[PDB]
Amino acid sequence: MIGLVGKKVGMTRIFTEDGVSIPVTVIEVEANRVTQVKDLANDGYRAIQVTTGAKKANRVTKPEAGHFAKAGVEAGRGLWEFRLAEGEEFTVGQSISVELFADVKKVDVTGTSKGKGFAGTVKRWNFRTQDATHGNSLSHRVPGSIGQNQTPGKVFKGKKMAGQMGNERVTVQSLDVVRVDAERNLLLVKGAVPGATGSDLIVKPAVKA
């Protein structure tokens, strides 16, 4: 019911007993500990601010380290929030592990995609490339028309043109868990999560059912 932030390690295969080669993703989920419990009357809405990781001594800043000393926790790398779902309180300091992700079937993965750079229209919105022969001059992969004529007299707001591709928080929904090693604190899920081989991504239980 609450999300868990973890680091993508990589993807690999898992052979089943019948022979099905299920491709999994290895998400390490270390000690997710609570740093703040927001309440209705105190702080508006209600959620928990969770962190994980191991940050160095001389990299954590004074407004950051003072926020952790109030919570009585260890300075991880960054902190995120997850909404509480109608009645649940733990403490400020609950080191949640992958233990609760052992009976929830499908989960949701939210992570940042790989930045493809300034990518063209043929790469971004699947625009079909023009003819590469038959007289064509300097216009093989150019987008062509981007508007009608004098009557609309402008280009419509939302026109699919070239720009920055990727490097954005994306969410793949409803992936199935297959195995959890609570001794190693791992998370093996069916399919593929967003990229950046050794970055982070939020794993949350099923919003779709």
């Binding site: 790989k114 930045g115 493809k116 750079g117 990518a119």
Partner: protein, 120 residues
Amino acid sequence: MRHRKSGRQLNRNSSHRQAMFRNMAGSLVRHEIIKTTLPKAKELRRVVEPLITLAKTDSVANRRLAFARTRDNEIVAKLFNELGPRFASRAGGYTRILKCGFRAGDNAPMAYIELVDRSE
């Protein structure tokens, strides 16, 4: 989009590129210190460091590979007699790079690169 790649093109084609670092290696070993721009110096670490790595192992097999690169027996003779036994203890980098100035005719970032023994 260049993810996880290596090497630096240097606005120069491949045959020209490998003929430069081969020629730049011979200049580095001969005078122990050269003045060149930063990306040429930063890539020269990826050439002569594997060269001095194979220069602390005297054998006819290793001399042929040390001659297959740099194509100069005098540089091969400058190695294996001085730079090999001068560096047969340090298992690491055999060069240091210092930022000196700016190439006056075109404002190019120059950088001194030398060999770390400099005892003469």
